[PDB]
Amino acid sequence: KSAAQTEIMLTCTDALNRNYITIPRGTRFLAYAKDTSVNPYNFVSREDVIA
Amino acid sequence: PVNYQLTRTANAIPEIFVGGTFAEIKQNLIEWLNGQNEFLDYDFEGSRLNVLCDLLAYNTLYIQQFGNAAVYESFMRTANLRSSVVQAAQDNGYLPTSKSAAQTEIMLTCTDALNRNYITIPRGTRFLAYAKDTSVNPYNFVSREDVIAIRDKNNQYFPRLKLAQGRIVRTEIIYDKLTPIIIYDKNIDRNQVKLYVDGAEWINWTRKSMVHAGSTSTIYYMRETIDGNTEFYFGEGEISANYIGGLKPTQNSTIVIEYISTNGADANGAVGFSYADTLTNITVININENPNDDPDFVGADGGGDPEDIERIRELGTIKRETQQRCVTATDYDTFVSERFGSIIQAVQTFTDSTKPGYAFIAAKPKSGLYLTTVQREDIKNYLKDYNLAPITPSIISPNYLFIKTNLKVTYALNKLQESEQWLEGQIIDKIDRYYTEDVEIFNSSFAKSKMLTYVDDADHSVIGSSATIQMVREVQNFYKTPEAGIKYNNQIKDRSMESNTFSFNSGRKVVNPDTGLEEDVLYDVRIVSTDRDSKGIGKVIIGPFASGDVTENENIQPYTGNDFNKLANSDGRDKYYVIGEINYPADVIYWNIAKINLTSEKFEVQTIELYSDPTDDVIFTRDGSLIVFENDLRPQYLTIDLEPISQ
């Protein structure tokens, strides 16, 4: 079987202002994968990165 | 050496004990079993009469440990296993301070509604303190002693007292004389205990607050009985005292022990205290001054936790050199120690020849820097009772040489977990651990390479490190410097010894906008040690000057040139005034601002840093001057850069 994959660029920010914020493995997202609207599926980053 | 008769040896476990590697035991047994005795008639077999030899060798190598260990912990210097160590240190009159509690002196401003004179403030008077790490939760405090106050002028009291950490607990017991009275709890500083027997008093023996010359019986004893639980007991006396000994109870009594719970060393923070006082008309007016004494204050001190094994030993044997009395420089070092210790990291007492009497004691608290007072006066009294009568002890504190790092650890972003902050602080204590272990003590130097190897030991991701360095030594009185004092002990690397800040006052008026005027408190100054010259020379300068205030006369004519003597950055109009000597090869600094003849009132607060950078990498020490870095108290110089690497 196989799973969908994209690359999204998150614009987010932190209150602590600390440099080199991380974004760990799972970071659950959810996506409609549109047929009309209703219901999401799920998403997980699964790797690391850095900002 | 020269003559071979001087070889001798240090403490040496003889070859008699040592103990087996196994197979060497197999060798010696076979030679004793097969040889010199039997020439085997054995009925087992060719192999069995062989094989069965090591079957009893495992019996040896076993009994050569299980029973042979006893002689290791029988003696002191060679023993391991605390229990034996401690238990064998009381017959040397020591005891190892199982734990400790924080102590301060606060002055309560409170007052009463009855206005009655001589208000009291009894033993417990529960307080509570955050001992700040952030804010949340208190610990506890109890005064534990007495005091008194006095009403003067306006109706108020100043019942300044001292206080310990924990709460208290009292367990009364009937003495069976067959029943080794004990405690069992993991606590109870042996420094502060009461233990009445049904009347009062019972000042015991092992630790005196008075020594009460004569006084005969009523003493008791406190030791160990291993296990962590303290033993109390009484002497052999009779009192039908008989001759000499402890009074002993009589077959039935109420024995009231009271100790302090001593939460632990976590309480070093102190700072803000609250009343929590319910007694009588005393209002608990607050305005509580934690440090009303003297200069910079860390909060409480002490807190203990049990002493390490490597500590006890060194202090365990040396107390045979003394007997409960200090006649010697090395004695004060043992009397300023776990008895009064946990408030003092290192001592090195010495006597100055020019000034008779007056045994001088340098001390560094674990809190860092200065002992303040009443923690000093406390060290005063506990000595002078055991001291050599005419001479008075005094606490000078050492002459501190700190060092300014400015180091960069250059980690890698890939392998971290907690990233910055937590690593920013994880590098602190590792550096701090380097000082506490090697260079915390006297006569020991430090090498920045050894600091970096604890730096690179932070966790993993840190790879490489490096630092500049400057030796900082801060003058106290300033304005002068002592006679032939203020010395680094190291080569100074000329074109160094850079100023601090300073300031000026006076300079006519120079009114400003807004409000009426000002005193012209701006326009600071600062000192520079210039160059070297034909041999030492080098002079030094007080700093930038515009014009006006000075006495020029014929003896000043301010100038070193536009040569070295680097410039302070301001308008400042140069014209640096020559002040003092600073001979480079034998390290000496000399100032005496009176040379240019200014007024001390024109200067702001004294106690200014100077901090030249060293020539050689390694910084030495002598003459009872420590190099110890303490961060938490003075952050002023520590600067580190985490500049990262992405692979």
Asked if A28 and A5 count as a contact pair (C-beta separation under 8 A), the reply is no
Residue B386, φ and ψ in degrees, nearest 5: -95, 5
**Backbone breaks in chain B (C–N > 2.5 Å) follow which residues?**
240
Cβ separation B420–A19 shorter than 8 A: yes
Question: No. of H helices and E strands in chain A?
Answer: 0, 0
HSE (CB half, 13 Å, CA atoms) of B514? 1
Asked if B280 and B112 count as a contact pair (C-beta separation under 8 A), the reply is yes
Question: Chain A: residue nearest B412 by CA?
Answer: A20
Question: Tokens standing for A49?
Answer: 């990165």
Q: Which residues of B touch A50 (CB under 8 A)?
A: 413, 646
Asked if B332 and B359 count as a contact pair (C-beta separation under 8 A), the reply is yes
Query: What is residue B162's three-state secondary structure?
Result: strand
CA–CA separation, B131 and B140 (whole Å):
10
What's CA B137's distance to the chain center, in Å? Answer: 27
Asked if B422 and B416 count as a contact pair (C-beta separation under 8 A), the reply is no
Cα dihedral B457, B462, B466, B471 sign: negative
Mutation choice for B interface testing from A14, A16, A21, A22 by most B CBs within 10 A: A22
Gap from B97 CA to chain A (nearest CA, Å):
44
Exposed/middle/buried for B580, CB within 10 Å: 0-12, 13-18, 19+?
buried
Q: What percent helix, strand, coil does chain A show, rounded to 5?
A: 0, 5, 95
DSSP β-bridge partners for residue B472: B402
DSSP state at residue B470: E
* Interface residues of chain B, partner chain A, Cβ below 8 Å: 413, 419-421, 644, 646
Angle at which helices B422-434 and B448-455 cross, to 10° = 140
Nearest to B160 by CA among B105, B213, B216: B105
Question: Chain A: residue nearest B415 by CA?
Answer: A48
Q: Which residues of A touch B646 (CB under 8 A)?
A: 50
DSSP state at residue B244: S
Asked if B346 and B441 count as a contact pair (C-beta separation under 8 A), the reply is yes
Strand bridging mode B254-259 / B169-174: antiparallel
Domain holding B328, by residue range, is 309-395
Residue identified by tokens 């600091």 is B451
Q: Which residues of A touch B420 (CB under 8 A)?
A: 18-20
Length of chain B: 647
Classify B561 in phi/psi space as left (phi over 0), alpha (psi -120 to 50) or beta: left
Nearest to B259 by CA among B189, B174, B201, B198: B189
Strand bridging mode B232-233 / B221-222: antiparallel
Nearest to B160 by CA among B219, B107, B239, B81: B107
Residue identified by tokens 């160059």 is B531
Task: Report CA-CA distances (Å) from B286 to B160, B269, B281, B523, B555.
Answer: 12, 19, 14, 41, 57
CA–CA separation, B317 and B572 (whole Å):
62
Q: What is the DSSP string of B310-378?
A: HHHHHHHHHHHHSSS---SHHHHHHHTTTTTTTS-SB---EE-SSS-S-EEE--B-TT-S---SSSHHH
Cβ separation B644–A18 shorter than 8 A: no
Cβ separation A18–B413 shorter than 8 A: no
Asked if B164 and B103 count as a contact pair (C-beta separation under 8 A), the reply is yes
Cα angle B541, B547, B549; round to 5:
80
Q: What percent helix, strand, coil does chain B show, rounded to 5?
A: 15, 10, 75
What's CA B544's distance to the chain center, in Å? Answer: 41
Nearest to B317 by CA among B337, B287, B345, B297: B337
Task: Report CA-CA distances (Å) from B334 to B321, B329, B339, B643.
Answer: 10, 9, 8, 46
CA–CA separation, B550 and B570 (whole Å):
19
List Cβ neighbours of B204 (8 Å cut-off, separation of 6 or more).
B193, B195, B219, B220, B221, B222
Buried-state track B140-158, b at ≥16 Cβ within 10 A, e below 16:
bbbbbeebebebeeeebbb
CA–CA separation, B223 and B360 (whole Å):
32
Query: What is residue B217's three-state secondary structure?
Result: coil
CA–CA separation, B166 and B300 (whole Å):
13
Question: Chain B: residue nearest A51 by CA?
Answer: B413
Give the DSSP H or E segment for B532. Answer: none
CA–CA separation, B639 and B630 (whole Å):
13
Closest CB from A18, A22, A50 relative to B421:
A18
Cα dihedral B431, B437, B442, B444 sign: negative
CATH of the domain at B361: 3.30.300.200
CA–CA separation, B536 and B586 (whole Å):
9
Q: How many CB atoms lie within 10 A of CB B99?
A: 25
Q: What is the DSSP string of B603-644?
A: S--------PPPSSSSB---TT------TTT--SS--EE---
Residue B630, φ and ψ in degrees, nearest 5: -125, 115
Question: No. of H helices and E strands in chain B?
Answer: 10, 17
CA–CA separation, B449 and B465 (whole Å):
10
Tell me the CA end-to-end span of chain B in Å, nearest whole number. 57
Task: Report CA-CA distances (Å) from B490 to B106, B451, B494, B618.
Answer: 42, 19, 12, 9
Q: What is the DSSP string of B74-93?
A: HSSTT--SHHHHHHTTTTTT
CA–CA separation, B415 and B514 (whole Å):
57
Asked if B355 and B391 count as a contact pair (C-beta separation under 8 A), the reply is no
CA–CA separation, B120 and B118 (whole Å):
6
Nearest to B170 by CA among B253, B261, B263, B259: B259
Residue B128, φ and ψ in degrees, nearest 5: -150, 145
Cβ separation B420–A20 shorter than 8 A: yes
Cα angle B120, B123, B124; round to 5:
120
What's CA B413's distance to the chain center, in Å? Answer: 37
Residue identified by tokens 């606490």 is B395
* Interface residues of chain A, partner chain B, Cβ below 8 Å: 18-20, 22, 50
